[PDB]
Design a protein around this ligand. Structure first.
Ligand SMILES: Nc1ncnc2c1ncn2[C@@H]1O[C@H](COP(=O)(O)OP(=O)(O)OP(O)(O)=S)[C@@H](O)[C@H]1O
Ligand SMILES: Nc1ncnc2c1ncn2[C@@H]1O[C@H](COP(=O)(O)OP(=O)(O)OP(O)(O)=S)[C@@H](O)[C@H]1O
Lengths: 538, 325, 44, 148, 325
């Protein structure tokens, strides 16, 4: 009785989709309350979305409408559960939670019946995954009622929704939104639309949440510094910052590595599609769509979390070195300039290095996965190509260094020019009272030629950089495809192999440039933190 | 600066830190039935179609489960005679729900489960029909489109009448329908500091509406300038004419209450006048005019104003000068 | 910012190098697409 | 920056022309989405510029403030005014962080939305290529360029 | 000790020895329709099922009695064609009662008794349907969930304003919906003994609400401390500050009346303040604050209170000292 069980599975989705529409149309026709397991619930809902896409793929492979309708119904059921939890987070109720719990229980029962009738005789894995996800969502609901006052005794002892991000006017609400918008930044639609019309200002801007201020970051940093100094330096301050900023940085880094994995994964499904048609492809196309969107979303969340940790760190160490500015002694002009450079360039170096910290962990795994993947697609010849592209990364660094050197020289000349200008633009009446102005303009032009001379070499290095940027992608394919025959087998190169190699070449060229800047930023940040330690401990 | 209640009549003060513990009940329906006629029609057809499809699905399911949906001759009688596919099942659902009863497909006395599904279908249909009728009738009692059309002049003036300073402000009707026993509650707010060191952020005080021997109410047929005279006892008696235009923060609100004729409900109109809105030493233009055989009211001159050579001085100093003259 | 600032900036260079830049860029991109276009026929 | 802008714009035009030539039908599907980007452009710049300048402003009095504390340090430690000045510096660093934070939030917004559209276009391109270039078109060499 | 009316607004005085002779009538329905929505739905489905089963039983009985229930071919026509058992009888009952009319089982023109049972079934069904629709619509006019949300501060204070002793007590709204023409009836009760030897167990007397020139009503937008000043004429003017805390029995009740906007009904809120509840010589904390561009009201400081260095003395002795100073 397969169709019988299929209809039995179709029923509960219809039940929920019909109960939701009156309440959804009431809600469609400013305090955010969050419940335990909200992030877990949204994660599980996205996993449900993925498994339902897989079930739709199965139903397409099989075809019999009644044999694949359950997936299309559970799709709208999960979307409506999302709308329900949005309507509950915007306005809490003890009854809508029960209305969701009933549906969860019924769906679990139907899936259990399906599993039993299958065991008595690809479907197996998808059914099991759905069972597990529905069970975990049921446990989340049970936790919610155990914490809430749904069926518990008289009063719930509610949380008094947090005034940290919902009290008197605040505009930057990142920590206090739906975990989908925490990823897709949907809360910025209102801000940007209002910004189009009315010019933004500090009165039109928000105020920072209690989660990120000078006081909060200073408190965490001084607690870590205290716990480290009570056990007694450069390494000390370093480990203090590390233990103080903790979980956020590693969270960003792991977001980043998972995104890197999926990005290395995309071209392989491209390859599979190209193979299939030349000799099971719509599924690969929709999977490619899903993997692209998810990879890029995770990449962006990673960027943002890293940037926010860096901004926290900048505020913290800035207010800390200002606290140190109060207790210093008068015996220690040059120190003032060194202090204000310690805030204008050293702190910016520290913070930008903290931006690039997760990239330094995610780059090696990216290049390793890239080389191992391209080897299994092109064979020994791939290795040769895998060398050439990699060889651009150290060379780039060298080029960069030359630039820096040139920059220094140029800056010197520039400064002198400014001096020879500051006189002319002050003795204006004196200058023009006897028309000695051309005589000084000759000297000013004499300085300018030297400045121009420096700029030639700088722009030559810039040209070499831009040239290598697009030359190495061409050279890789050249010396790889022409050398594929030369290296060994010289077997027919199907379009899939060549185009997958092309995709991987671009996906590997993009990260390679960043490693050079990362190395420079890291060494400069190390020097700047040594400087900060020498200052902060005088 | 900040206003107390807006010109349109809505309130401006935003409430903060409400307990909000009691507002956790199901007042679902009435709020949906208050909505706009298009939105309300949309949600009504939505509810009806939702119930219809739900019970059509359950009937198709039960006909499939009994085996009566499997086309077979003999050895059975379908719980619902002449049922073939989901289309005929939905047709049976709409035939039994909205109580048309075509009777081409007949529910039989063989299956009590169909009897139960019918006995719950009919009662839920009757209950949803009853609520969706009561709510639309309660909606058709909406006369809010005709209410709140009352108008006041944008800025109010002060003049010198009967040797005393006076407040002049226009009100008026906009439809044929009258308003019964309309009363005026004229109030003034200000941040006040008591002599005991107590500072209040806002202080409402009643300024009287000067009518005959008594009375808090008026009679509205034509635009009637409300006539009050500030005296030494009035709270507004202490201000100055040159400090009101820019710096001071004084909101004079009027609350005109009254019951409309046709509906009998008691509506009201609240409006504010700021310190920068009110002006000094002027006179309104006479609206009413002796027409052919009636009185013609021209609303173009409603907010028009003419200069009057009246002395400009503070009400306290004006009362002192009256004691001197 | 209007096209006038960039127009003056590029006209300070002169007609000698403007086209030498623009057409060379167009031709480089045309080559970069044509190599893959020919690889497409290479495959089968 | 001029070189980078030129390379970027010409690479984008070339890629659009490639994915158009590969599939005739896919072209007609991509012009809608691109028009979407136009609306995403305006609303971005008129804010991205604004926030930008705000950042600059919150950077200027902060640093200057630092310098003022360093020179007149004896006077400030004498008046015992350290608390009020620390309050002022917390205020200034908050005003700097809110700006440098909204700027990165807006950049993330534009990034994510442009990327979602850049994934919609490859979805539609592959969905048209699998059918048109295989079932009826019967061409293998096309879908490669378009997908890549 | 005993209170007059409780804080929640309900009355405390229990009535004894009511004649109760007139309350012997059938007001059955309205009281059932006032009940909770779950209980009311329960009793509605109960009434419907009761009537349905009653008439199904009588129809099965009549079909059994005529002999048409005895399965036989020829020599008769069943009063209701195609009737076999009690199940089909109940199906016919629900088919004719709720007016679906399947018509698989047909009542015939052979038996006038079936005609009579149908002609009474339909009219009783229509009457019960009409009452069960009117009552649920009358129920959906329940806006009592939104009413009675008005709040007063738990204890009221007295202070010294404008050189005279004054009563300060906070009121306020809890929703966006306003209350039209809210009036205050402030009263005080006490066991009083007249000079003629008459002792009354409780004596209500009106203590005025001090507003502008006149008026018994107020205007509620923000929490407005009701401001009364006890003078030598006021009944409360004679008490002492040290005897109120423990021994004396004085209940000061306030009755705030007013008509809500959306429904138009006139609701009210009554609250009491005992002798042990009220305290002396304090001041409330200012609630309203000039926010970004509006007025922010903080309800956390609603019942908060600060000490004020004010003299502590009896109102009679205070008036004597005012005569001396
Ligand atoms: N115990 C009671 N409870 C309720 N109502 C009462 C009661 N006693 C009297 N009433 C009614 O209220 C009115 C009060 O008048 P009474 O005090 O009873 O004087 P009366 O001369 O006894 O009048 P009666 O009892 O009608 S002959 C009467 O008209 C009664 O109808
Ligand atoms: N923040 C608030 N928002 C809305 N209503 C409130 C709030 N606080 C109190 N109330 C209610 O209004 C009345 C005001 O009394 P309060 O100022 O709270 O004095 P109280 O001694 O704290 O009384 P409680 O809180 O009930 S123990 C109370 O009876 C509450 O029921």
């Amino acid at each position: 009785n397969g169709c019988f069980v299929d209809a039995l599975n179709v029923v509960p989705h219809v039940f929920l989709l019909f109960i939701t529409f009156p309440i959804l149309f009431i809600g469609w026709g400013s305090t955010w309350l969050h419940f335990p397991g909200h992030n877990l619930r949204w994660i599980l809902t996205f996993i449900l979305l993925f498994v339902l896409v897989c079930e739709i793929a199965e139903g397409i492979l099989s075809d019999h409408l009644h044999l694949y309708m359950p997936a299309g119904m559970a799709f709208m059921a999960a979307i409506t559960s999302v709308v329900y939890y949005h309507n509950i987070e915007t306005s809490n109720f003890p009854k809508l939670l029960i209305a969701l719990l009933i549906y969860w229980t019924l769906a679990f029962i139907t899936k259990t019946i399906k599993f039993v009738k299958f065991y008595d005789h690809l479907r197996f894995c998808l059914t099991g995954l759905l069972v597990i996800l529905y069970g975990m969502l049921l446990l989340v609901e049970v936790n919610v009622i155990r914490v809430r006052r749904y069926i518990f005794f008289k009063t719930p002892r509610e949380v008094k929704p947090p005034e940290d991000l919902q009290d008197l006017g605040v505009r930057f609400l990142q920590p206090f939104v739906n975990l989908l918008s925490k990823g897709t930044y949907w809360w910025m639609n209102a801000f940007i639309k209002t910004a189009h019309k009315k010019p933004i200002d500090l009165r039109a801007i928000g105020k920072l949440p209690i989660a990120m201020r000078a006081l909060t970051n200073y408190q965490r940093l001084c607690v870590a510094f205290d716990a480290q100094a009570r056990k007694d330096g450069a390494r000390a301050i370093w480990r203090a910052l590390c233990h103080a900023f903790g979980r956020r940085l590693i969270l960003s880094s792991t977001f980043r590595i998972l995104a890197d994995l999926l990005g290395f994964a995309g071209p392989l499904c491209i390859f599979g599609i190209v193979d299939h048609l030349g000799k099971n492809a719509y599924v690969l196309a929709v999977l490619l769509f899903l993997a692209l969107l998810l990879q890029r979303t995770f990449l962006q969340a990673s960027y943002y979390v890293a940037i926010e940790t860096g901004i926290n760190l900048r505020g913290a160490i800035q207010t800390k070195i200002y606290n140190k500015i109060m207790h210093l002694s008068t015996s220690n002009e040059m120190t003032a300039g060194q202090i204000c450079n310690l805030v204008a360039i050293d702190t910016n170096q520290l913070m930008w290095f903290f931006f690039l910290c997760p990239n330094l962990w995610a780059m090696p795994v990216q290049i390793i996965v890239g080389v191992i993947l391209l080897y299994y697609i092109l064979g020994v010849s791939a290795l040769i190509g895998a060398a050439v592209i990699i060889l651009l990364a150290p060379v780039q660094y060298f080029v960069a260094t030359k630039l820096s050197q040139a920059q220094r020289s140029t800056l010197e000349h520039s400064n002198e020019r400014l001096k020879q200008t500051n006189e002319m633009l002050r003795g204006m009446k004196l200058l023009k009272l006897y028309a000695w102005e051309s005589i000084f303009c000759s000297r000013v032009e004499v300085t300018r030629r030297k400045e121009m001379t420096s700029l030639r070499a700088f722009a030559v290095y810039t040209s070499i950089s831009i040239f290598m940027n697009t030359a190495i992608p061409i050279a890789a394919v050249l010396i790889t495809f022409v050398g594929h025959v030369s290296f060994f087998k010289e077997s027919d190169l199907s379009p899939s192999v060549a185009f997958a190699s092309l995709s991987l070449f671009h996906i590997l060229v993009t990260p390679l440039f960043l490693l050079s800047s990362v190395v420079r930023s890291t060494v400069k940040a190390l020097v700047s933190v040594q400087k900060l330690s020498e200052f902060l401990s005088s | 600066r900040a206003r107390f209640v807006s010109k349109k009549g809505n309130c401006n003060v935003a409430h903060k830190n409400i307990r909000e513990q009691g507002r956790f009940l199901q007042d679902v329906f009435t709020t949906l039935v208050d909505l706009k006629w298009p939105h309300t029609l949309l949600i009504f057809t939505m509810s009806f179609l939702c119930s219809w499809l739900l019970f059509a699905m359950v009937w198709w399911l039960i006909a499939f489960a009994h085996g009566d949906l499997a086309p077979g001759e003999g050895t059975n009688v379908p719980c619902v005679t002449s049922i073939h596919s989901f289309s005929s099942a939905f047709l049976f659902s709409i035939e039994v729900q909205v109580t048309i009863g075509f009777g081409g497909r007949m529910v039989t006395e063989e299956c009590p489960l169909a009897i139960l599904i019918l006995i719950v279908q009919n009662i839920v249909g009757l209950m949803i029909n009853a609520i969706m009728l009561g709510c639309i009738f309660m909606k058709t009692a909406q006369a809010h489109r005709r209410a709140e059309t009352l108008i006041f002049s944008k800025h109010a003036v002060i003049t010198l009448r009967h040797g005393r300073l006076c407040f002049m402000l226009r009100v008026g009707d906009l439809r044929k329908s009258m308003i019964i026993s309309a009363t005026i509650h004229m109030q003034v707010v200000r941040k006040t500091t008591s002599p005991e060191g107590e500072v209040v952020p806002l202080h409402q005080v009643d300024i009287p509406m000067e009518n005959g021997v008594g009375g808090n109410g008026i009679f509205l047929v034509a635009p009637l300038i409300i006539y009050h005279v500030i005296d030494s006892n009035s709270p507004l008696y202490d201000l100055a004419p040159s400090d009101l235009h820019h710096h001071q923060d004084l909101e004079i609100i009027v609350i005109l209450e009254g019951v409309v004729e046709t509906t009998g409900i008691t509506t009201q109109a609240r409006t504010s006048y700021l310190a920068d809105e009110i002006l000094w030493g002027q006179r309104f233009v006479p609206i009413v005019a002796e027409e052919d055989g009636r009185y013609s009211v021209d609303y173009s001159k409603f907010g028009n104003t003419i200069k009057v050579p009246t002395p400009l001085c503070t009400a306290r100093q004006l009362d002192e000068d009256r004691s001197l003259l | 910012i209007p096209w006038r600032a960039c127009t003056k900036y590029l006209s300070s260079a002169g007609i000698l190098l403007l086209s030498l830049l623009v057409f060379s860029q167009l031709l480089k991109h045309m080559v970069l697409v044509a190599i893959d276009y020919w690889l497409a026929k290479w495959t089968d | 920056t001029l070189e980078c802008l030129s390379r970027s714009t010409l690479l984008c035009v070339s890629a659009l022309t490639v994915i158009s030539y590969v599939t005739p039908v896919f072209l007609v599907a991509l012009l809608p989405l691109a028009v979407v980007c136009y609306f995403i452009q305006k609303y971005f710049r008129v804010a991205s510029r604004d926030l930008q300048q705000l950042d600059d402003t919150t950077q200027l009095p902060l640093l200057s403030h630092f310098a003022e504390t360093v020179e007149g340090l004896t006077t400030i430690r004498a008046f015992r005014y350290e608390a009020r000045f620390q309050q002022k510096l917390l205020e200034y660093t908050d005003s700097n962080n809110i700006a440098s934070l909204f700027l990165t939030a807006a950049n993330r917004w534009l990034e994510v939305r442009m990327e979602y559209i850049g994934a919609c276009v490859v979805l539609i391109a592959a969905a048209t290529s699998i059918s048109n270039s295989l079932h009826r078109e019967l061409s293998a060499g096309l879908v490669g360029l378009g997908l890549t």
